[PDB]
Design a protein around this ligand. Structure first.
Ligand SMILES: *C(=O)CCCC[C@@H]1SC[C@@H]2NC(=O)N[C@@H]21
Ligand SMILES: *C(=O)CCCC[C@@H]1SC[C@@H]2NC(=O)N[C@@H]21
Lengths: 684, 684, 90
């Protein structure tokens, strides 16, 4: 059967708390979001047909030829981490897919998977990424999706073997995947080269992204000048791609800056589709976006109205309304935008237990001084809270700038961002200043990631990095030179198939093998946890995390025909070893399950008891307060010789050594009231 | 005395809840806002020197001649109702005035007084608005203050005597008030004519505002054409003012629309300093502000970063950072902006008992549909929850456009927005659709304010209002045409002064006389409360609303030399009549005070007791169950005759007639247990 | 009136005083994965002696100085707090 595992899970959730940690103490709202009405006929024709009947170059040419603007929706990947800790299930997701696939045909592409997507899909949420992605392609055979990838490290935080990344990309493309993004935390050209090589090997639309940092309109800003970016862009275009892109992880683009940048790019490449990605944090994102989109841009990322603002992308509504009496002519019925926003607003309160609003009330400025990535801040606050330093979270970001100067002005998105975050964590944890930390950085132990970065497991930064600190930290450590990926010894995964199989594998797929190759520890942990309690993501989100409330009936599905009707009566109490019995209702049956409570620890220690099997052992005849001791440990004792006096209230008994010899040790402190029959001392 | 009154207030707060209504049940964080450091020197000279040295026309010319632009802070007026219910005390407010006076001298002006500032200062806050203003100028002798005033109603919601408005303006100008904004929700010209006449009577800078509603770039929008607004502005400037503003509560300024408007108006008036103000609700406001501030704007309204965006005005940080290398040349040290914003962020958590983040999560689209004004939405939700309709508060707004249609496309800011909201409230609580509500508008009792408006007390709209509905509602009520402000008989404020004095006044002031003149009821309530618990507005905000916690000491300053210490001991229990005894540490002594509890309801019921002196009254001899009643009320009874039978456990008792006489009432009734000495029968 | 029902609660967790260089305090809180050195053993300088684990980050303890350790307080597989006396270097 299968019901027993999930029933046990429900009972455990009732007895214990939610398995996943709770950042902020709250409860899900008692409101179900309203699903907008959907038609019946097949979804309209989008762009999957166009790329189907053409090549990536032909499709890109057709897109470029279009007069107007095409929009990117990141509400399925980026808004997650921007507004939450990316905890959204898939069960809630598979409720608007028919609507958008029918309603939205003009939309360019949708981003669902991303970097920090699988590291939670099994670690905190317990699901399979390939499974859910498989369940969406049939729902939307209309609009291409888009993968976010890093250059060297495929999904992980350290550069993976080149063959591994290649075969991973090949499998991902074989999954029916359409559009791919190539990116690197640094400007390490071999990293992007390897990424695009893997993308071309997979075969399909290839887009690379350039990070942005600092100012290009500021003459004082000189480390990353315009001509620096020009060289980067020209090198990448000589490498040859399909579509270019620009990243604004912090939302630092002023309108003048990006419009002059676009003028420069579109000047020398007046054929290439141009795409932008930004995070609206400073609050001026929409203005610059629209300005330097009217300038020369072609594609724009945008988040849903309810999932907008703060740090996420700007909204549907503002862009649609502004681009109305313009030649760009977005031309999208905003009523469907309205109902989409209403559904999302309804859905937000479900995960309201954790949110940036409780900490971050309104969009804060000074991000220029902080340069904290938008997709990182919520997870940073959560990890600080789980660390216990969530109280002094403001001081944490205060120390972040000093760590930036420790590593110098560098571009940080996924890996180095959290590297600086962890270094600042150490900084604030030790409560030490910047200068002397620079001074006595030799003996001071540093987190493993800092050592990895200093060794060079990622690549060379554009501007290099200080030597003396690296010598002070690495000291005697071997240091990686050249490309880490090429220097990395390629390894086979075929043996891992059989290892997984004969350990616990009887249906393991190559996707699962690759997942184990990525994160074997948490992979096996998720596998065993799922095997214990059966499959999840078949129930309501509040039902998943909060569980059913007492004395109510609810329904749960298993497949198309397997849908149940479940009610709960009450719970027993701790019977004899911290165990509970709870009583569920089937469609017509009554069930009783046992749950082992975890809140019963009951740690109690006692003075050693004298065991009667050992004749040498001496026990306390009467409980009471010890008056005096006549024999010290390791001293000779005569037969029937007084050694202790006991007196509780009325009776006084003097304990004598019943056998001749010497003692080993006395368990008496001369000043404790000790109960009878206790191992006061022993006789050889 | 004052100490006893405040101690009594604290005890009452401990026993009961907060006196003011609580929308959302929460508590402020136990953290104090960080006050940034201030220098020691006197504040510099900004524009107050110009105003005291030049005239309003000379000052306006000097402002206009400035190269660049000037900036507005609205955190002290507009942000209040934007994100709160304007419940901010002056206690926290008076802690940054020294900072800004020494730091910020480039601000064109500061807005502190507002339309919804006096009412809250009476009803839900117990302070004196004149008093609070009478310390603010003492802290800021550097920046002119600004105030938004309505024509027909000075601060109220109905027409007021012209004498009252003239006297109010004169008093305010005498107070030292600097900048005056004249505006009316309707474009009823005589209203603004009277307002500007009053402003000129006061003597000083006169500024007028024009609401922007609808689309000017839309050819379909015809009800208020560009030439409609052009004629409005033409006749305004024909009246003769100093500065013009464009009001946008809904925040619906397209960049193209506002830039073409500014260009068109500037061409015909290349002398007028331009003021602009809007509410960033849709999220695209800042784009339009940058565009048509580059075009021709001179003065720009901005809200602080911590209370920025969402539904409020845009932020300091975005404008300062974006316009750095620009001939507009903001020229503001952004370093102090950061601490200014962080103080507000810290203070925001203090008022966590009610905030839009509970309900309105992110800035929503569809504002073009509901067209609800910005700063009033929070109060709408609060009042709906007060009615209990805040549960289904969504249904309230979805019915608002229907009420607008009933009244036709009209301009609504303060009064008529309220009228449409009340109409929607009545509709939704009655469950009335469009055709259903309009079908029977005769028998249905419409709210009072609806009749007030349908009369035409405010004035005739631009295009009139439907006649069939007005006939079906007003029936045969008196109908007033023309300007009711002139039609209103002038009223004498002199005798009312003596009335309020010999009622409860002893040394009242003309400010208080006026305050009672507009609002006498709440003025009386405020005076009664102040005489009850003494002078308030010296408490910490959390102390004011929560009160002292037990086993905690703190310091409260009453006067400059009158500062003392308070600590809490404990609380007693209900002694006999819902009274509690609470003990306080003095600076070195102890005090005890009694508080009458309110949650103690005591009642008496059930059968009464037979009175001994009344021999005719017959009482139950034993406690037991009524079995049978021998005699029915109204029948003759003989001496020594059975009356009733009582049986409890084995005791059978038959009640004999004490006398010979007819029975009048059967107090014993039937089949209800009665104990001994209870009136069963009465004999006269 | 002094209550006799205090019942003070114990916590163990020895504290490494920073002024005592010999004492070693945990830079991070959390559970210990492995310890490379037994008590009373000779260790190098800048050498791996203990491994400390957190939720998603890892730090390896560095030898404070060149000497022989004296006592190991934490043995294996318990969660520690910030600056916990675990080892002493001599
Ligand atoms: C922990 O569950 C994984 C999310 C935290 C790491 C992610 S990875 C991509 C972002 N960049 C960063 O530094 N943290 C985020
Ligand atoms: C009731 O407490 C008074 C607050 C509501 C009135 C204010 S006045 C100005 C705004 N316009 C409106 O209709 N309500 C707001």
């Amino acid at each position: 059967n299968r019901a027993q595992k999930l029933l046990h899970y429900l009972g455990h959730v009732m007895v214990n708390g939610p398995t996943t940690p709770i950042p902020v103490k709250a409860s899900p709202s008692p409101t179900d979001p309203v699903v907008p009405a959907v038609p019946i006929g097949p979804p309209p024709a989008g762009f999957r047909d166009i790329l189907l009947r053409e090549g990536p170059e032909g499709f890109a040419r057709a897109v470029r030829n279009h007069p107007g603007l095409l929009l990117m929706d990141t509400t399925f990947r980026d808004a997650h981490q921007s507004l939450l800790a990316t905890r959204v299930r898939t069960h809630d997701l598979k409720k608007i897919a028919p609507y958008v696939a029918h309603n939205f045909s003009k939309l360019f592409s949708m981003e669902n998977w991303g970097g920090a997507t699988f590291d939670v899909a099994m670690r905190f949420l317990y699901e399979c990424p390939w499974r859910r992605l498989q369940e969406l392609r049939e729902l939307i055979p209309n609009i291409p999706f888009q993968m976010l990838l890093r250059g060297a490290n495929a999904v992980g935080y350290t550069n993976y073997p080149d063959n591994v990344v290649f075969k991973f990309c090949e499998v991902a493309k074989e999954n029916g995947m359409d559009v791919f993004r190539v990116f690197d935390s640094l400007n390490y050209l071999p990293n992007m080269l390897l990424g695009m090589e893997a993308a071309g090997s997979a075969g399909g639309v290839v887009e690379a992204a350039i990070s942005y940092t600092g100012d290009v309109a500021d003459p004082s800003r000189t480390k990353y000048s315009l001509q620096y970016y020009m060289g980067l862009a020209e090198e990448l275009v000589r490498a040859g791609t399909h579509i270019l892109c620009i990243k604004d992880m912090a939302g630092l683009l002023k309108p003048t800056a990006c419009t002059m940048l676009v003028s420069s790019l579109r000047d020398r490449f007046p054929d290439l589709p141009l795409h932008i990605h930004t995070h609206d944090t400073s609050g001026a994102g929409v203005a610059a976006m629209l300005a330097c989109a009217q300038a020369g841009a072609d594609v724009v990322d945008v988040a849903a109205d309810s999932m907008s603002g703060m740090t996420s992308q700007p909204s549907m509504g503002a862009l649609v309304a502004c681009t109305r009496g313009t030649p760009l002519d977005t031309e999208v019925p905003m009523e469907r935008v309205f109902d989409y926003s209403e559904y999302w607003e309804g859905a937000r309160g479900l995960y309201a237990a954790f949110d940036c609003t409780a900490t971050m009330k309104s969009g804060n400025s000074d991000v220029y001084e902080n340069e904290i990535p938008g997709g990182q801040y919520t997870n940073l606050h959560f990890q600080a809270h789980s660390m216990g330093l969530g109280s002094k979270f403001k001081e944490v970001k205060k120390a972040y700038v000093e760590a930036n100067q420790m590593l110098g002005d560098l571009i940080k998105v996924t890996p180095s961002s959290k590297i600086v975050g962890d270094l600042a964590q150490f900084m604030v944890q030790n409560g030490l200043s910047r200068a002397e930390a620079e001074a006595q950085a030799e003996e001071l132990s540093f987190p493993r990631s800092v050592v990895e970065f200093l060794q060079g497991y990622i690549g060379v930064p554009h501007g290099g990095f200080p030597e003396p600190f690296r010598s002070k930290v690495l000291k005697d450590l071997p240091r990686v030179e050249g490309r880490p990926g090429a220097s990395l010894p390629p390894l086979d995964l075929q043996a891992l198939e059989k290892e997984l199989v004969d350990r616990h594998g009887e249906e393991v797929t190559p996707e699962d093998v690759l997942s184990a190759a990525m994160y074997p520890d948490v992979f096996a942990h998720f596998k065993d946890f799922t095997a214990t309690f059966g499959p999840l993501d078949s129930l309501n989100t509040r039902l998943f995390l909060q569980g059913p409330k007492i004395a109510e009936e609810f329904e749960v599905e298993l497949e198309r025909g397997k849908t149940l009707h479940i009610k709960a009566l009450a719970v027993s109490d701790l019977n004899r070893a911290g165990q509970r019995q709870v009583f569920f209702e089937l469609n017509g049956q009554l069930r009783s399950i046992l749950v082992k409570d975890t809140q019963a620890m009951k740690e109690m220690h006692f003075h050693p008891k004298a065991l009667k099997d050992v004749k040498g052992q001496i026990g306390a005849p009467m409980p009471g307060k010890v008056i005096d001791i006549k024999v010290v440990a390791g001293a000779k004792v005569a037969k029937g010789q007084p050694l202790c006096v006991l007196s509780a209230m009325k009776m006084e008994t003097v304990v004598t050594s019943p056998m001749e010899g010497t003692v080993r040790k006395v368990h008496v402190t001369k000043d404790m009231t000790l109960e009878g029959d206790d191992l006061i001392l022993e006789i050889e």
